[PDB]
Enzyme design. Sequence first.
Site, PDB file in Angstrom:
ATOM      1  N   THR A   1       0.845  -1.182  -0.043  1.00  0.00           N
ATOM      2  CA  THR A   1      -0.079   0.064   0.067  1.00  0.00           C
ATOM      3  C   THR A   1       0.799   1.378  -0.054  1.00  0.00           C
ATOM      4  O   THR A   1       1.679   1.147   0.682  1.00  0.00           O
ATOM      5  CB  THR A   1      -0.959   0.075   1.254  1.00  0.00           C
ATOM      6  N   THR A   2       0.525   2.361  -0.576  1.00  0.00           N
ATOM      7  CA  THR A   2       1.279   3.539  -0.983  1.00  0.00           C
ATOM      8  C   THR A   2       0.211   4.470  -1.002  1.00  0.00           C
ATOM      9  O   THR A   2      -0.558   4.408  -1.932  1.00  0.00           O
ATOM     10  CB  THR A   2       2.288   3.504  -1.825  1.00  0.00           C
TER      11      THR A   2
END
Lengths: 196, 229, 227, 219, 234, 239, 204, 237
Positions: A1-2
């Site tokens: 996740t970013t």
Amino acid sequence: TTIMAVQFDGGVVLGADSRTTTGSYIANRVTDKLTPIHDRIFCCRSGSAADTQAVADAVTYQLGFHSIELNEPPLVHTAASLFKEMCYRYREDLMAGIIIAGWDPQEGGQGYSVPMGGMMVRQSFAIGGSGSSYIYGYVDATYREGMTKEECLQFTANALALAMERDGSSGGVIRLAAIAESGVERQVLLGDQIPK
Amino acid sequence: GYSFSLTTFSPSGKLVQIEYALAAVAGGAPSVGIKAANGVVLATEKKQKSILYDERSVHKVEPITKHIGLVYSGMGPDYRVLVHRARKLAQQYYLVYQEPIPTAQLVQRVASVMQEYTQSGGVRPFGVSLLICGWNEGRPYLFQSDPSGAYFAWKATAMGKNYVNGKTFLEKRYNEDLELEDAIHTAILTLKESFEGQMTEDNIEVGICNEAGFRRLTPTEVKDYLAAI
Amino acid sequence: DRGVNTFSPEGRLFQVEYAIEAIKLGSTAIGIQTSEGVCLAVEKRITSPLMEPSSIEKIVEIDAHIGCAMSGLIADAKTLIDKARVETQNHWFTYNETMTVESVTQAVSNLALQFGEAMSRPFGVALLFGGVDEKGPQLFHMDPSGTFVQCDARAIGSASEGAQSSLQEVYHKSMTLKEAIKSSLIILKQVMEEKLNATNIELATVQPGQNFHMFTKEELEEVIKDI
Amino acid sequence: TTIAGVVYKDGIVLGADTRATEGMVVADKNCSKIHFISPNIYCCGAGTAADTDMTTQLISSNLELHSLSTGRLPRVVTANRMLKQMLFRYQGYIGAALVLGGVDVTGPHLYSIYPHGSTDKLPYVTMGSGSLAAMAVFEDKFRPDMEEEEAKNLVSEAIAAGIFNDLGSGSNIDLCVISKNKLDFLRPYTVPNKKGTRLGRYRCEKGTTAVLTEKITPL
Amino acid sequence: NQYDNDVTVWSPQGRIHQIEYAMEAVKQGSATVGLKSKTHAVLVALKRAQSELAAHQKKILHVDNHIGISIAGLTADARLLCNFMRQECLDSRFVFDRPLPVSRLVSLIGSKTQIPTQRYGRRPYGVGLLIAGYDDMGPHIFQTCPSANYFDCRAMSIGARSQSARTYLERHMSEFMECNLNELVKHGLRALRETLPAEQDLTTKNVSIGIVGKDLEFTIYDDDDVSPFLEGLE
Amino acid sequence: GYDLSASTFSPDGRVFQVEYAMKAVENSSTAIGIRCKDGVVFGVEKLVLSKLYEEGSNKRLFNVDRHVGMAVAGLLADARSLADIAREEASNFRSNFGYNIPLKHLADRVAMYVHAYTLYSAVRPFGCSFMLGSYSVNDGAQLYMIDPSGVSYGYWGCAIGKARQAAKTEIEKLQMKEMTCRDIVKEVAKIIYIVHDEVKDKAFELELSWVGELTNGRHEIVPKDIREEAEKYAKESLK
Amino acid sequence: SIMSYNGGAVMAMKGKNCVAIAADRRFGIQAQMVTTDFQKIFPMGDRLYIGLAGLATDVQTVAQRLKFRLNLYELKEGRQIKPYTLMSMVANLLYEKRFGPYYTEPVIAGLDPKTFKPFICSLDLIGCPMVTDDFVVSGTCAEQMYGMCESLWEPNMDPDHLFETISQAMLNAVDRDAVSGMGVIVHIIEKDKITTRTLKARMD
Amino acid sequence: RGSSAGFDRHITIFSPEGRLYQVEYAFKAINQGGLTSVAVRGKDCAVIVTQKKVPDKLLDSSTVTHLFKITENIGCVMTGMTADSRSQVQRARYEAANWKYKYGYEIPVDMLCKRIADISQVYTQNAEMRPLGCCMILIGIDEEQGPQVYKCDPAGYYCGFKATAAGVKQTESTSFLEKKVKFEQTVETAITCLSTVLSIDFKPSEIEVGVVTVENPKFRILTEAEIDAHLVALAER
């Protein structure tokens, strides 16, 4: 996740990827991690999916009721505080980091980061997620004050693509949202349009 | 809340609040129930005070499950509470036994609920009387429940305003060989006696129960039956 | 009809007044305090020769150094006596020392007005506490209203008025315990209806250096011999 | 186990196998894993069998009450909401993984629900032990806006791959087709496997067993 | 007629009769006087005895090293309120480790006392209080009523036949702020004597004194210890 | 006997206990509040019943919050209870949502709490009326009045107590929408001096306070010298 | 394991218009015998039986609670219980104690009191019904019974062949289990009679 | 006729004819206010009109209103006691929010009406509290069958209407609307009904109007300029 958010004069830009894994298996590859709490307030979510989804639903409920009582559009600081209170009350149970971003007429376009532990702080640009350790130097070197709305979408896309290439838990497509007074503009960058 | 009973014995042994609740019930709109060889028919009068009212907004005949139906005579607001509790009880029985609740068990549970309000603190008895119809084991049923908590099993019954004449009508024109359509004709005729004004498909409500379940008739079918009569 | 907690137009609680009225139907108890000890004397109302006098106890032992005499509704005094015993034992357990007569009286009288709508009405029993502590012999009086006082000579019960009037002239600060016993017996003889005969009376004393003591038949005969 | 679901131009297709095991021994050879929730909503369950059974029964009763009170057909979002809230309330001790699907006044909807209360809205989903072998087939051969028969063939292929490539899956294939105008419940759809014919005759003739005591109780 | 049995019933004139009856309960107690100067606060109490063989009832209580109270009315209610006050002072000293200010204690007393006068089947506290204290702002005299209302005074008298003492204090207010301790005590004694019948006099048996000051903890003088204050009077 | 409980309707549709409660407010001394171009000013006449009480006893002006001030009339114990309730509501709001409670929200919450007491036989209605005044840079100046029945309204100038009608007649002549707080401070003292009745209510004291932008949004008591200036102006006008 | 503390074996088989239920007879504590005539099959009606295998205390507790509930049901309703309803009742009773479960696995066998159509089923530890058409097994020797029944069972068995089949399966299955055996009890449930028999088995 | 016994006029218990007098008095509690409101629905819109009285010049007219917003798509008119009305509105808002949170979609108008009437029915059975003295009218738009007008009364009764009125002049307005009904511009009909029953021609500052439309589903309140234009149209036509 970013996940990432950037401030510009008149609003905020939010960006995220779209992969959710269970170990080394990609359970979902077109995930939507940008959730609208109200008309012009958004949150980006990282961590356990169950915890983040439940907390987002609860805060949506509370903020809507508060807005109906007061007969006014809510503030970004109010939503950040509600998230902070729930995250701090149950810090031994929840595993969730959140970015809150929005636009209110009193203070413009703002962004707050509520990490694990129920802390809350305001920032000009804020990155989060598992894959954000690989773009700290990039955003430190490239950010400058006075960026335009169209110079913040390109910067966000570049940072997210660079995080995607190196992280194993990040991938998929890039989802972008720009929030200002007129409304919210949403777009998706597929494989051909992702920077290389 | 008050912790003392508001219903007490009279020096002649009568429970007077129950008599007053029955007096309230006897002033409600008429209802008729008839049990035939193929199913049960419930009919009620739905006259309304003005033309500005929406005739289809609320219904008097309501389904409890796929095979049980209710009509009432008395106060509407109490009828709604009783309907809600009956639905919850049927769902609990289904959750436990994985089988639809028989009619005679639902009537018993509802009657116990209605009796609880006669010997409890700071509350008044319900002011409604209920007619229940159902289909079980290949045969139909017809039950009546009173504000006191006592239930009876009938073949044909009438309730509400002018119910003694309705009972006499049913007694003189009932036999055990009726089909369902003859039963519907008899029920509509019984409602016709002591009716005020000209009746149409919009001011009466009819519901039937047979092998396929319980269903309330649409106004087109009521028009067909009224034209036939 | 009115509640248990209503004031009267001249600022008194009705139930306390009624309980104080009920006090005046009990037997007469008289207590005298001297520098040598404290003495308690009480009546017995034997309603039939078929009753056993020894089953009537109106003078009880709160503790080895504290005794109590009661009048009014007798059945209600059991709860107060039980609490007094329990509090004295708790005080000994925690502090390893004997309680004071005044502290026992406060602890007992703190239960007087604890009622409402748990208790539903006042107690209607009057008590005399007699004890010996670091300050010497002490006599305390407590009534249903929750007020307690210290006395030199007190009389409670149905004939309290005449007994107190007699105690007015009898008492003086230099009395000996023997004289106090004689005077109390004389007053009891005056106020009683039957004849004092060492069976329908009860007498006890508390003296420094020795525990609470209950007089037996022989001592009663010897003392009544002079009267 | 193997449960799969796909969305085509008019509705939903769901499919499952029928084997139920206890350890490494086959207990049931004709298990049923497609559960009724509403006349337009169905569910396929995986994980612990008892938990899925009780969860689906409870949610079905609650939706029945809600639909009786309102008087309208229920929505898939409502069932998804109640399922996910109940599952999150228990902090993951109910090992139920669910594929939920239905058609309402908004159109076809298909959700996947995990034991901890997560939820995904997707155009095709698989779950079970043989979830990867069927997801391979969906990744290879899925197109948007298929017909009914093409979607049925696709689901059958995914379930067959799961059966043949995984030890915990086997036996038959069940299909359920939900459309705006109908509902088909095929049981069974395919029988890929059959039991071999017995060669010997092991019938025990009368008098082979020795008996100590005997009593007769005429009813 | 029917408006005077409950504390939750309004009279047609906008009055609550049970509160007025609780007021009537206070005016039957023996008199009490309180007054202060720039440096000290003084309470003077007149005690009563049922008979010549009974000791006089106590009327001055210890609440804390800088706070004392005086009572008029029902005794058990006074004991309840005194225990509540002692607990509040102990809690304040435990948490913050400094003495509790007097006004913040009086606010707590009023908050506690107001609740019974609103609910069904409850009664007001039928006791009136005079509170003498000292803190960083100097001496304080407070007066409390059964109706949960409290007043801050320069001098005040409560109890039966207390109007005469009030008149004396109103006449002589001007000298109080300049008087020393002995003159203040004598002023209080004269005001208390103004309430006695003409055939009775003050004595060491029926007079109690309580004094608090800048460098003086709350002290109580009874029996022979009040002889120096009575000497030189009149 | 339809007037013994708060949960009984009269045969004509009235609840008499609330009216009997308002008759308690109607017997109190008048307090007025005036809203102006940049603030709100409160003024009370406090009767002194003896010469033994100190100056500043029985305060009828409370500080509910940094930006919110309050003025009461009626039974003083009920008012001192409601002040604590309002303080708790404001504190809880700031602890949940992180910013100062708007006045229109605090007024509604206190009004609902007050109305909760006029439905049951187990409690009795409050016998107190009060005014809430505030000033915010975003919301301007705001004045609200609350009733023992529980009704809350917004005003330009209000008076509560025994002399409501005379005070309102005097306030209506001001045209307060175009002048600042300094003029209002004299006008309120003047109105208070003319509405007082000195032959029946023998003695009284004037108490004033304001909230506005001259205090930077804080509710304060009027400084002393301004108070004596206003008193002198009112007395010379009365002459 | 806890299910193997006492041992035990029970099975049910379906014929034509008849059912058969069999159980072993042994009560012991691990590797020591205590008694032989232990009861594991209980009647729940005229033509309905339930067999419990597992931990003996839970066997007896479950049997008694089930009889409690069944008696109350039959008194209120006024009719006999059905095999579906009994299976659902047992599943409910077992699931109520989730996270604290009873250590038993029931087996139900009977005839429909209205149509006399056979019914056999089995439930697991926490109450998951599993209805079959041929045979159900339960206990410590389940693999042996599965092996024997897959080979011996054939459709449409009359009472005699059904009795022989179930006797042979149970005997040969419990001959290979150390903590089960020492007697076999067989009930044949039929339309108009019930037949109870005790078989001759090894006692070692 | 009109007989009584016991405490049947002081609590909610049956009289010898099965009547609840304390519920009949709560209806007269509504007429104490002295205001009247109307609600009309057309083929594609719903409109609510109320009378606005400002008895004092010192009152702030912005805070004096009887039109409230429950959800962004539902609007309300309250009549009767003011505090009771505020309590009912603040309850309805919570009920709507909880339904949306729990079931995932917006509450219908008739289900909100059902929940409010279910709450109100309890007060007529338990004897320790009294019924609220207010009446509620709700308007909304449902995507399947169009505009919705509903009314609740303090006895627990609720219903749906084509046109309704509440307040002191309810009886006259009922006959007026019955004659009129026995639409694209429903606002004119509502305004003329109110004027006829009140025998007063309205200035633009004496009434409030709120609308919901199929094309604009959100609840909005018209300003004084739009009401003035409508009144001018009334005068000319």
